[PDB]
C-alpha cells in the first residue's frame, strides 16, 4: 500500500530486473532494511525519454508526408511545438464535441485520402498556416532583434519611393494567374517553415557583419600559443629512476675487491680455443636434463589447484544472490563511509547503515545455516570476510570518532 506511487516503483523493479527483484527481496523481505531506504538511495535512471525530444528539423510536414502508410510520433510532436495555433486547435477540437474516432473519420475525407485539390498532400494546409504565420510576422506581428542589426535606415533605403520612379514596375496589382500565384505561395511556406523551425528549436547588418567579426578577432595572439602552460619541471627525478621496487640488499664490498676481480678475470679470459671442454659439458648434459624433468629439482609440486566442484549449479545460484546482495550492502556502506562528512545527517545515515549492517550479518548467518547444511562443503567465508571488514570499519570509525569527540 505504502505510497500510491512508490508502491508501483519498487514493485515495477521487483517484477522486471530478475537480478534486482531478488536482491530487493533478499534485503527488504529478509528483514534487514526497509523498502523505502533501498528504493531511496538507488537513483540510477535516464534523464527524460531522450533527455529532450527531436526538434522540428525541417519538412515536419514532408518527412513522411501526410501518410502513416499528449504523446505521438515525430510529426505530431513537431507540429505541437512548431505551430501553437494547431496546439490550441487541438485543445478546442479534441476537448469539445469530437474525439479521435470522429476526427480521424473526418480526416479520411478529400485532400488527404480522396486526392481532391490542395497543391500537395496533407501538409498543404500546414504550409498555408506557416505562410499565414510568416505574413503575421510581416504584417500583423513584428520582430524583436532590430536595433543596430536590422537597421531601419537599411529598410528605408530599399523599396525606392512611393511616387513614380525610373523603374517603378516592381509589384504589379494586376497579373494574378493560377500557376504563377501557386509557385509564389510555395516559396513563402518554405521560408517560414525554416523560421518556425528556429522558433520550435528554442529550449542585414546582423548575420553578415557578425560572422565577418567571428573571422576577425585576434584570439590567437589574445593570450598565448597554449594558454597558461604550467610547465612541469620535475624536481627529484631520481625517485622516478629507481621506482617503487623496495630497496634490495645491495652491499658491494670494499673497492679492493674491484682491483682483485679485475686482476683475476683479466688473467681468466686469457685462455681460448680449447676445441673440447665437453667432458664436463657431457657431465652437464647428463645433469641439465634432470632439472628439466619433473622428478628431482626444478619442480615445485605446483600447478595443482585442487578444487571443490561437488555441487556446482544451485550453490552458484546461491552465491549469485549472495554476492549481489552483499555488493549492494557494501555499495551503500563504503559509498557513504569514506569521508566522515562531519554533520548529523550523514552520521544518522551511518547509523542506519550500522543497523542494516548488523541485520545483514544476521541474514548472512541465517543463509549460511540454510545453505551449507546440505552436504558439508563450500566455505562461504569470503562474504563473511567482507561483512567482518564492514563490522571492523564500523567499530574502528566508532572508536575514532569517540576519540574525536
Amino acid at each position: 500500500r505504502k505510497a500510491n506511487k512508490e508502491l508501483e516503483e519498487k514493485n515495477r523493479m521487483l517484477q522486471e530486473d530478475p537480478v534486482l527483484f531478488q536482491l530487493y527481496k533478499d534485503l527488504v523481505v529478509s528483514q534487514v532494511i526497509s523498502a523505502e531506504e533501498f528504493w531511496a538511495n538507488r537513483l540510477n535512471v535516464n534523464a527524460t525519454d531522450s533527455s529532450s525530444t527531436s526538434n522540428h528539423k525541417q519538412d515536419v510536414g514532408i518527412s513522411a508526408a501526410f501518410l502513416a502508410d499528449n504523446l505521438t510520433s515525430d510529426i505530431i510532436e513537431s507540429i505541437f511545438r512548431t505551430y501553437p495555433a494547431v496546439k490550441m486547435k487541438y485543445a478546442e477540437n479534441v476537448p469539445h464535441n469530437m474525439t479521435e474516432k470522429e476526427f480521424w473519420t473526418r480526416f479520411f475525407q478529400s485532400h488527404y485520402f480522396h486526392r481532391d485539390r490542395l497543391n500537395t498532400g496533407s501538409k498543404d494546409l500546414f504550409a498555408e498556416c506557416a505562410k499565414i504565420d510568416e505574413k503575421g510576422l510581416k504584417t500583423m506581428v513584428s520582430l524583436g532583434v532590430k536595433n543596430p542589426l536590422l537597421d531601419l535606415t537599411a529598410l528605408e533605403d530599399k523599396p525606392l519611393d512611393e511616387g513614380y520612379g525610373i523603374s517603378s514596375v516592381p509589384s504589379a496589382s494586376n497579373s494574378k494567374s493560377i500557376k504563377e500565384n501557386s509557385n509564389a505561395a510555395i516559396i513563402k511556406r518554405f521560408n517560414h517553415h525554416s523560421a518556425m523551425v528556429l522558433a520550435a528549436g528554442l529550449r542585414q547588418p546582423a548575420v553578415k557583419r557578425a560572422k565577418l567579426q567571428e573571422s576577425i578577432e585576434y584570439e590567437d595572439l589574445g593570450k598565448n600559443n597554449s594558454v597558461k602552460t604550467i610547465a612541469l619541471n620535475l624536481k627529484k627525478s631520481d625517485r622516478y629512476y629507481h621506482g617503487p621496487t623496495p630497496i634490495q640488499s645491495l652491499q658491494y664490498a670494499t673497492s679492493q675487491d674491484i682491483i682483485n676481480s679485475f686482476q683475476s678475470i683479466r688473467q681468466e679470459m686469457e685462455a681460448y680455443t680449447p676445441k673440447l671442454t665437453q667432458v664436463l659439458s657431457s657431465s652437464a648434459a647428463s645433469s641439465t636434463i634432470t632439472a628439466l624433468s619433473p622428478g628431482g629439482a626444478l619442480m615445485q609440486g605446483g600447478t595443482q589447484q585442487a578444487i571443490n566442484q561437488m555441487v556446482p549449479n544451485d550453490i552458484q545460484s546461491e552465491l549469485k544472490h549472495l554476492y549481489v546482495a552483499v555488493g549492494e550492502l557494501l555499495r551503500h556502506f563504503w559509498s557513504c563511509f569514506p569521508v566522515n562528512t562531519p554533520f548529523l545527517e550523514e552520521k544518522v545515515v551511518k547509523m542506519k547503515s550500522n543497523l542494516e549492517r548488523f541485520q545483514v550479518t544476521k541474514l548472512c548467518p541465517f543463509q549460511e545455516k540454510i545453505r551449507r547444511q546440505y552436504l558439508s562443503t563450500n566455505l562461504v567465508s569470503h562474504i563473511e570476510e567482507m561483512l567482518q571488514t564492514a563490522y571492523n570499519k564500523l567499530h574502528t570509525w566508532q572508536s575514532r570518532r569517540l576519540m574525536k569527540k
Partner: protein
C-alpha cells in the same frame, strides 16, 4: 611539449550512424573504415594510457544511444565494435542528447579528469532540440573538452566546437591522414588554464595467490558467468576480490593501480628530443650505427642532441615510436 598533460582521461567516442556513413568515399563505406580505425584507436589508447576509460555512443535517427558504457578494458569495446559492424545507419544524427548525457555525467565528475569527447562526425544537416549556439555557450561553461574529426566538409561550427570545448577540428583526406588524426588523438592533449590539478587517492593492491595451498583461504566467486576465484587482487579500502588489477573500485571509489601502470606513461613527462637529421656524408668518423652496430648504407644519418651519437632510419623510427628513450643518454 614540456607542458602539463591530461593523464587521467575519460574520453568518450561519439560515432555517426547517419545516412552519410553509408557513402563510399572510403574503400569500404565510411562506417566500416571508421569502425576499423576505432578498433585500432581503442587498442592503441589502452596500450598507451592504462588509467583512462572509453565510452562509445552511436548517434542514429535524431537520437543518441549509449552503446558501450565508460569502462577501461578493450575487450568489451572491441566486442561491441565487432557487433556494430552489423548495424544499419538510418536517419539524420542529433548531436544534442548525446552531448547532454555526456555533459550530465561529465559535470560533477572529479575535477582532475580531463573529460574529453571525440565526435567522429560525417554528415552536414544536424537537428538541434534546443539552440545550437546556447548549447556551445553552455558546453563552454561546462567543464569538458570536445574534439571533432570531420568527414567531407568543414563547418565553422566544428571550428567553434573544437576551439571552445577546447578541442580541435579536422577533416579527412585518406586512410593515412585519418590514421594520423586518430593517432594525434591517442596521446594525452595538454591542459588549459582551467582544469583542476587535484591529488586523487590511489590504491596499490598486491597480488595474492592461494596463501599456502589454500590453508585458510577466502574462496570467492568474483566481483564483475564467473568461476570460483581462489586468489588474486584485493582492494584494501574495502577488501573485495578483483581478478584484473586496473579496475576502478566498484564499491569504494578508489582507483587501483599496479606498479607498471604509472610507469607505462612516464615518457610523457620526461619526453624525447629531436634528432638532428642530416642526409649527406658529412664528417662521419663513426661509420657504424650506435643503435644496432650496422653500416649506414643510405644517405640519412640522425644524430642525437645530448650525447650526439649516430643512428640510422630503423633506429630512428624504433626509438621515436617505441623505445621512447635515446640509448646513448642512458649510458
Amino acid at each position: 611539449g614540456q607542458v602539463r598533460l591530461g593523464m587521467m582521461r575519460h574520453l568518450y567516442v561519439v560515432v555517426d550512424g547517419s545516412r552519410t556513413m553509408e557513402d563510399q568515399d572510403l574503400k569500404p563505406n565510411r562506417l566500416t573504415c571508421t569502425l576499423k580505425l576505432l578498433e585500432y584507436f581503442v587498442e592503441e589508447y589502452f596500450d598507451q594510457n592504462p588509467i583512462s576509460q572509453i565510452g562509445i555512443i552511436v548517434t542514429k535517427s535524431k537520437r543518441a544511444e549509449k552503446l558501450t558504457e565508460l569502462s577501461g578494458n578493450p575487450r568489451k569495446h572491441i566486442t561491441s565494435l565487432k557487433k556494430a559492424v552489423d548495424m544499419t545507419c538510418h536517419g539524420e544524427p542529433s548531436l544534442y542528447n548525446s552531448l547532454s548525457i555526456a555533459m550530465q555525467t561529465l559535470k560533477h565528475m572529479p575535477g582532475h579528469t580531463s573529460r574529453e569527447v571525440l565526435i567522429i562526425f560525417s554528415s552536414l544537416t544536424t537537428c538541434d532540440p534546443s539552440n545550437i549556439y546556447d548549447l556551445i555557450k553552455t558546453l563552454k561553461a561546462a567543464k569538458i573538452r570536445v574534439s571533432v574529426i570531420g568527414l567531407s566538409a568543414e563547418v565553422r561550427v566544428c571550428t567553434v566546437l573544437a576551439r571552445e570545448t577546447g578541442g580541435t577540428y579536422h577533416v579527412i583526406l585518406d586512410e593515412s591522414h585519418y590514421k594520423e588524426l586518430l593517432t594525434h588523438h591517442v596521446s594525452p592533449p595538454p591542459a588549459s588554464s582551467s582544469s583542476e590539478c587535484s591529488l586523487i587517492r590511489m590504491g596499490f593492491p598486491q597480488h595474492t595467490i592461494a596463501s599456502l595451498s589454500d590453508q585458510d583461504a577466502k574462496p570467492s566467486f568474483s566481483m564483475a558467468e564467473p568461476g570460483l576465484t581462489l586468489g588474486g587482487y584485493f582492494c584494501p579500502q574495502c577488501r573485495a576480490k578483483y581478478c584484473e588489477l586496473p579496475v576502478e573500485c566498484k564499491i569504494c571509489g578508489l582507483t587501483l593501480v599496479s606498479a607498471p601502470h604509472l610507469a607505462r606513461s612516464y615518457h610523457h613527462l620526461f619526453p624525447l628530443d629531436a634528432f638532428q637529421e642530416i642526409p649527406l656524408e658529412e664528417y662521419n668518423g663513426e661509420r657504424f650505427c650506435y643503435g644496432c652496430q650496422g653500416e649506414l648504407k643510405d644517405q640519412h644519418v640522425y644524430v642525437c642532441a645530448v650525447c650526439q651519437n649516430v643512428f640510422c632510419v630503423d633506429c630512428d623510427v624504433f626509438v621515436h615510436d617505441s623505445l621512447h628513450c635515446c640509448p646513448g643518454c642512458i649510458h
